[PDB]
Amino acid sequence: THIAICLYYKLGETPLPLVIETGKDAKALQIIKLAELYDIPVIEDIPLARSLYKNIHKGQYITEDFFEPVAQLIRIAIDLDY
């Protein structure tokens, strides 16, 4: 079962990283295709993906167990814009 979790964090707007979209199966495949189209970093991390999928529903902010693992993702994925 394929899963994809789309995280959004923008300083000043989102008080915490936000799960803005999720998908399983066909929808997960589509999210990944769109990620490629828009050059959004995609990271494979099976334990984290499964746990996020189960715990943090679409439109929910991440919770404490995820703060650091998601921070690490943001640090590698952030576009520094130069």
Binding site: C6, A35, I40, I43, A49, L73
Partner: peptide
């Protein structure tokens, strides 16, 4: 239509299994 694509376009990172 288009909400999915607009969300992905603005997103920060995707985690997958």
């Amino acid at each position: 239509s288009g909400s999915l694509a607009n969300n992905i376009k603005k997103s920060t990172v995707i985690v997958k299994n």
